[PDB]
Amino acid sequence: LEALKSHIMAAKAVANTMRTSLGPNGLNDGATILSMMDVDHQIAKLMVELSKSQDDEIGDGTTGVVVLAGALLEEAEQLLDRGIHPIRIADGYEQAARVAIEHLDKISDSVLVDIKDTEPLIQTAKSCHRQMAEIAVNAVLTVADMERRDVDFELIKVEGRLEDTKLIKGVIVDKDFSHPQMPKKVEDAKIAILTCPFEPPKPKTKHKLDVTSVEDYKALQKYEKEKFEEMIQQIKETGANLAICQWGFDDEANHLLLQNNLPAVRWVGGPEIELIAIATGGRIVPRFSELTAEKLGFAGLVQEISFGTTKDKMLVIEQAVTIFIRGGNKMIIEEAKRSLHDALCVIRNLIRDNRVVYGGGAAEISCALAVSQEADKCPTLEQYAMRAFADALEVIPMALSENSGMNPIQTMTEVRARQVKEMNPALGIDCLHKGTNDMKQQHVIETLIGKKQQISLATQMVRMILKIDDIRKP
Amino acid sequence: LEALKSHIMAAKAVANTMRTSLGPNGLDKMMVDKDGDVTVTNDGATILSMMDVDHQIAKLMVELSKSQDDEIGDGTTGVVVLAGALLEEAEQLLDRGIHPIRIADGYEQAARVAIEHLDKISDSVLVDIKDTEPLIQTAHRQMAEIAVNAVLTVADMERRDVDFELIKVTKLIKGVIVDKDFSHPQMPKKVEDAKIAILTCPFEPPKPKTKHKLDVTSVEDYKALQKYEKEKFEEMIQQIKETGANLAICQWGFDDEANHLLLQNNLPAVRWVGGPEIELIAIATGGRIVPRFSELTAEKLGFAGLVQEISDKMLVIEQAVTIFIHDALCVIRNLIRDNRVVYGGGAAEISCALAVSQEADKCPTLEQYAMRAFADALEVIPMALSENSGMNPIQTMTEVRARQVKEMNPALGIDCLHKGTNDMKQQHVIETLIGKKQQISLATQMVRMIL
Amino acid sequence: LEALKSHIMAAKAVANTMRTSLGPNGLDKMMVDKDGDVTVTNDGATILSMMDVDHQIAKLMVELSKSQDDEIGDGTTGVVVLAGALLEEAEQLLDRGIHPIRIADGYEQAARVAIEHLDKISDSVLVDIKDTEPLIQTAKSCHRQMAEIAVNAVLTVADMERRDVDFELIKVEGKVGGRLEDTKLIKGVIVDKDFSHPQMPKKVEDAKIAILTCPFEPPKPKTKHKLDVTSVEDYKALQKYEKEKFEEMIQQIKETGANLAICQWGFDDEANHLLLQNNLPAVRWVGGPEIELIAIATGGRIVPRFSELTAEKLGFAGLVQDKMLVIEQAVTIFIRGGNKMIIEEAKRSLHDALCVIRNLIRDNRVVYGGGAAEISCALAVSQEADKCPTLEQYAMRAFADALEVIPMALSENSGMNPIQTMTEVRARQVKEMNPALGIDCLHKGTNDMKQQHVIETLIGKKQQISLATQMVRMILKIDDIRKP
Amino acid sequence: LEALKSHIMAAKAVANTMRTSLGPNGLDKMMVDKDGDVTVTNDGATILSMMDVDHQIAKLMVELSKSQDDEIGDGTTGVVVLAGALLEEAEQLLDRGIHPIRIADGYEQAARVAIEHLDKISDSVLVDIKDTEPLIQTAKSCHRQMAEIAVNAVLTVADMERRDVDFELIKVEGKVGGRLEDTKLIKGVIVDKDFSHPQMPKKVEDAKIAILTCPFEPPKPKTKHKLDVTSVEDYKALQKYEKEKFEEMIQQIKETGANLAICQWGFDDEANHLLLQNNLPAVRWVGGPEIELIAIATGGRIVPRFSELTAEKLGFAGLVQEISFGTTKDKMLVIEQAVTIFIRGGNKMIIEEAKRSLHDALCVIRNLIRDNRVVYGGGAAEISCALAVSQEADKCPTLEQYAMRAFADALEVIPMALSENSGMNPIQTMTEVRARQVKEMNPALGIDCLHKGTNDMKQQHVIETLIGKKQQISLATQMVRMILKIDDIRKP
Ligand SMILES: Nc1ncnc2c1ncn2[C@@H]1O[C@H](COP(=O)(O)OP(=O)(O)O)[C@@H](O)[C@H]1O
Ligand SMILES: Nc1ncnc2c1ncn2[C@@H]1O[C@H](COP(=O)(O)OP(=O)(O)O)[C@@H](O)[C@H]1O
Ligand SMILES: Nc1ncnc2c1ncn2[C@@H]1O[C@H](COP(=O)(O)OP(=O)(O)O)[C@@H](O)[C@H]1O
Ligand SMILES: Nc1ncnc2c1ncn2[C@@H]1O[C@H](COP(=O)(O)OP(=O)(O)O)[C@@H](O)[C@H]1O
């Protein structure tokens, strides 16, 4: 049994590590903290990969996920001391999780779309953020489904006065394309995406190619050039226009492309190939034998663009959008991308589910209330498990008050008392010493599907850990 | 949790290290580096540009005090000292049970109080004519006469205020001067209307990428080989001469009769210049750099009006000035951005401490205490100065503060040079409003980040 | 704070070493004497008595628990196990950040709530005519006999005409060797110590007894005194002097009647012979308690000098006859059994019975045990806790949980699933409105503790909850243990 | 200077151990007795009485505190807490370069400011009629009897004649067993010590008491000699000799008409036999104290010589009674002329809480007789005094300025500690309470460390006796001054 308590102490150590980074006064962004911190325990490795890739790619609030999981396990230990089997604790945790998720529907205030309604909600995820809200709303709406379904994913990425921030109709990419004397504007680009090397086909037998004179040296250069010309014709045989290429060719070879009118980009990175292959839909060609008119990107416009000193190229009309934040100072960016990411994510969740619950611990407290209600009407030991789930739900408001210098148990208990007395499920922690506790008066929303993903994912992690023993590491 | 007092102890150790080098009576520091010479000097700008990094917070003290202040002001030592004082008081606040967030917020509010109070203390300096010069005498007046014009040549003087870091070191040159002669003197010693071709590429024949082992037999093929690579070199000369070409600046060299190959082709060049010289010329003449192996175009060439060799070589009619033979140019630039000044010697810190104290006396939430702490933190600048001049620190500082309240003179402050009547006004100890604002705001950013 | 958590750990260990011996299926625990015998027995009173302690907190617990509850009767184990539960909950409250003083205050609140609720659970028992015993067979084959012996012994030895108190001059003498049920109630006192010199008559009518604590020594002098015998005539004069003063002692005793004369110290084998030639018969080597029992039972005197003996102070006993003392001015119970362990166990159960009777005389209200009263008090405490704002709230709820350790322990001691049985009995108690519903740790089929008759005395349970709350309050308020 | 900062660390250690035991919610401190019982109680006087006396600075604080405050008042904890606060504040002034003498002089200045401000804060209380009793309940659930017992104890042994100062003539005897309500008021004296014999009359009425300090011993020569008895007849003659002189001393006592005779020192096993058969009730082996109580209570003079007394120097206790308490027994003197309080409670340690609590009540009443002015506690007087000290501090030039401000802050340790001892946020609660004192102009507003009701200390009736607080701040300033002026601690 002790292995379970060891796991509980490990995951509890992770959650306690990430408690102080919860809330606006955190000490952060738990997504980056988990994405960077290295973990020794396998249970700590399992705290990540479940909180990171499952929640950062759907919603946000990863810190709340790991903290809630740590509280759940910490209560589950005290439940283990009474002799309750871990399967019972996990089942009760699942039942209480159902209760809370259902209570989210009862707390939820619904917001509409298509006329503001989301942009003002985006002003909360941060003048400095009105134009960014506009760019996020129009960005998601540009690549949104909206033919009911209400599911559209991140085909949108951001590149590094902020009033000059643009929405790029297609895809922006670095790398001026090989030799400036090439046509700076390719119209209807039949892109050839190649991840293959540019070397003559070397025979696979004993070489020792003893070139004895300068004449045979120049002839060797002429052969090495001839094979490359053959490659140019092998590419232009199925749609020229452009040729995205990882690997380079250097000065002598570049000309041959220019002379043969085949615009091309030199040794792009890992991305910018996947980026352009997704934008233009053209399949990548990795081999020097497997390219045709079927594996070609279908760009409508490709052009090189300068900014005084450096220059990058854009490709628009592609078969699906990017955000270009030009603002200078370069200390602002990578942080405008965080609030803008929260914008795009909150918008995506609002398209998926247009219901919001009010944060600051309010929804946590009222969910703990509902779970406690469904616990007081139950026999079997799962009763204690449900009450423990409520107590674990009440760690988010406690953690907020803690990180804001307030007395956690006192302020949390008083706020819960106000939630029961005033029938207001939006009363929570102040966190900023800013007026009242009414979160709707403070504009703190958290998108029902996001909170539901928090509770559900934390429950999944906790149940998985509540099983697991023996860890057979070599 | 305990890591806060530890990090505060480390950054405070960095501050106490540089406490003795503050003021005109500051102590020098040996500071040798890797198996080389020794550079004895005070002025914490170069001290923090060196100083091995012990803690991660110890490095965090640099580049915030260094890159944020040296590029706007110069008072880096005051920045790190003030930061160490703010953290040292922040520890005492952490003893009372204050949360660090409230300490940082109170430090921000008090910083607003002081920065705004500087506007009230500020004296105005006039521009557009001669007598910005004598002010510079505070930071053989010729240097001043050189500095002012040196900025004014590359300054806007209208409302955009950008002239940053384009000047370097008894006369002023309207362009840029660089070393490294013309490489083979038979070249034109005065290139006129120079379409400078700045290439940072190697000069080698394009070797193939397959198995070689060139087995040249009998001197015949040896001479044929030398003639071959010289032929390709001539092809390169025609690659540059195809685009303006008037002059060619190269990071790599040739180092034989290849110079003649240029001379016979009439393409003057310069051999083996460094990076922080190629960039200097490239921005000076506005000529894009060519990195790839002689894949250039006519737009990536400099357009310098005149470049000539002198008994080194000079580049004029460029764009963008150099002084032919900083402590003044920074003050001048700050005066152009904002012509308001405050009086140093710790006076501005004492009056700002008074303003923060007053604005803290009527205050609710615990940030009150923090603000009070901030005031005391500022008063470390006078005391330290007194300490560096052998005077009783708290005695002298208390007297100067009491006089600043009694006489309503926000310029009374430490006369560490033991010269005169404690006034700083008729002592000409000036500190340029933007500089002091940058000090307070920067130290506040460091402290609030460590918290 | 860490020192307080260590104190909670030591106290919790003391409780864990005790909860296994709670209830009728309680385990035994050897507890060897000081390089001597053993005493295999549950009943946490003797356990805490014979237990030596290491930690000062444990020492404090062992002193405070026996300081009151054992002087009341049963429940000495419930004090330490309930204290351990309260401290174990108080730890989980400390981890939340609640100050210890708030936990203690909430524990006092819940203590008053539960103690007030016991008055509502309470029933009533009558004390004037018999059939108190049905409440006594619960305290302990021959339960009716022992119950009648205890009730008669207490009702004989009691004020009861107001004052409502009982002073235990009841002596329980257990003689190994008998037939399990030959236990008799003797209107008088019985002690061992045979008559000195066998030829003294084993029967004294109208025995006027002289109780002495003086040594049978020649009248010694004071000051320095060095005695030098210079001739055989002075040696014989010494022996004759001591015989003279001795017979002076005997005649001095017989001047006041003195049919018998118990003495605490011994004789000389020459002494008891001179006592045989006179009609004095005496007993020797009795002992302090055994001469106090005779002192108040016979209307004695206990004089430490023979020469100051007067007839007015003699203790009258109608018949002195081990040796029995009947007809005097005081009752004793003579337990008889078989294989060395019939008694001592009969002594223990009889002690429990006498305690129950005395407490019933003090307060004739009872609550039904088996953990039922603890569950009902827990329901009341949590109910009042839901109607409380400040942090004390939590503490009160914790107190409730702490109470529910008494069922869980009992269940645990009878092989049942503690959580499941305690929860089932708590739900059955909520729905049936039956506060006399508890753990059936004897496997009798029923759960109603009114049936099966499990009694616990109101003031006994009150003393349990109050004393345990006091101990937990002290342990929670202690730090900086000096140890000079 | 390093020695001085070491002294500050030791003193502030003594303070840090005791600020947790400040207020009604103070922690208990186990402190066992060397190899015996324990004494678990929150009380600065007792905690400093035990107190691991290690550092000479700590022993110095323990010396001064009990040397004055506990001998005149009671507030022994706030002296050491405030002293530790003042030294901890003085450390940062030492680091600023301020000389210790300037610091101590500043603490004296601000201490005078606060002591003078207490007079402004002071309120009043009446005497002789029922007004003192209720404000004894605050010296703490049946404490209504505590007030009555203490007030009747001070007013029975009345000063009444003015000049207004009086203590000793009150003993508190505690016998374990019972409940707190069993505490009864006062008639005369109650001491331990059974008589001297079982058959001694347990009730000696109209007892003319003989108070002796002599031994009941036939006087020895004292010259180094050896008593050699050569025959049994001379042995008997010795017994008759010393019995004879014993009886001479007995009849020497009862010739003055002594119905009772206390002895204290010498009393053999033959002596009480000869005193019983002579019908002279007597008690032996009584301490030095509990005899002058008999001398003043029964108006008798202490007879020194081996029975050279007259009826002029005898007692006159109306009824002497021996009382049993289960197994032990005490001796009480009623109808005398000096009183004593008999306390019951049981549970081995309740009769200690209630004992020193009653002591605190008696001290409060005595201080009210001295000066019937009080300030309202709960840290209110400390906060108001801190406000005054800061007011005078901002209007001061030389470095004493800083010291004065320090003193202010030091005072505010008393509220914070209280807040800390009640689970509240100390800095926030103290700050808010002080701001409320400024706005509402209510100097009787301090930490509600009992969590019951409002904030103003006029309700809850928390009084402090002006003389007590004045002597508190004065004594703490004495400690801090002495420690500041100390270095070099030699200690051979
Ligand atoms: N303005 C606000 N006021 C109160 N609580 C907030 C506010 N903004 C965010 N929070 C709370 O902070 C919690 C965690 O967010 P944060 O600490 O920023 O990182 P993450 O979103 O990764 O958890 C959320 O549960 C939310 O309730
Ligand atoms: N002549 C002077 N009289 C008084 N103070 C001076 C004088 N010159 C410089 N100072 C003070 O010295 C401080 C620090 O300057 P210094 O130690 O030379 O390097 P840095 O400017 O990098 O801190 C300034 O804040 C200024 O107030
Ligand atoms: N026959 C019984 N049926 C159910 N419970 C019982 C029975 N006898 C005793 N108990 C329970 O056992 C508990 C402990 O009693 P015991 O261990 O004998 O001594 P103590 O009362 O000192 O703990 C009591 O609280 C009582 O409720
Ligand atoms: N009922 C109360 N309410 C508020 N404060 C109190 C109360 N009783 C005592 N105090 C405070 O406790 C402080 C210290 O008293 P205490 O802890 O009993 O030890 P001492 O009397 O030795 O100082 C006093 O300054 C007083 O202000």
Numbering used by the authors:
A (entry chain C): 31 to 57, 72 to 170, 180 to 213, 218 to 376, 382 to 536
B (entry chain D): 31 to 169, 182 to 211, 222 to 363, 369 to 376, 382 to 387, 403 to 528
C (entry chain B): 31 to 170, 180 to 360, 369 to 376, 382 to 536
D (entry chain A): 31 to 170, 180 to 376, 382 to 536
Which text from the study accompanies this structure?
TRiC interacts with approximately 10% of the entire proteome and its function is absolutely essential for viability of the cell. The general subunit architecture of the CCTs subunits comprise three distinct domains: an equatorial domain that includes the nucleotide-binding site, an apical domain involved in substrate binding, and an intermediate domain that connects the equatorial and apical domains via two hinge regions. The CCT5 homo-oligomeric complex has the two back-to-back rings of eight subunits similar to the full human TRiC complex. Moreover, the human CCT5 homo-oligomeric complex is able to hydrolyze ATP and refold misfolded protein substrates.
In this paper, we describe the crystal structure of the human CCT5 subunit. The human CCT5 and CCT5-H147R subunits were solved at 3.5 Å and 3.6 Å resolution, respectively. The CCT5 equatorial domain is formed of the N-terminal (residues 1–154) and the C-terminal (residues 418–541) regions. This domain contains two nucleotide-binding loops that interact with phosphate groups and the adenine ring of ADP. Loop-B - 103GDGTTG108 - contains the classical P-loop motif, where threonine residues coordinate the β-phosphate group of ADP. In CCT5, helix-10 consists of the residues 309EANHLLLQ316 and the proximal loop of the residues 234FSHPQMPK241. We have solved the CCT5 homo-oligomeric complex in the closed conformation, which shows intra-ring contacts between the equatorial, intermediate and apical domains. In the homo-octameric CCT5 ring, the stem loop β-strands, β1 and β2, interact with the C-terminal β-strand, β13, of an adjacent subunit. The sensor loop (also called stem-loop), 41 is located between β1 and β2 in CCT5 and it is composed of residues 63DKDGD67, where the DXXGD motif is observed for all 8 human CCT subunits. Analyzing the CCT5 sequence and the ring arrangement, the rls loop corresponds to residues 343PRFSELT349 and indeed makes contact with the substrate-binding interface from the adjacent subunit.
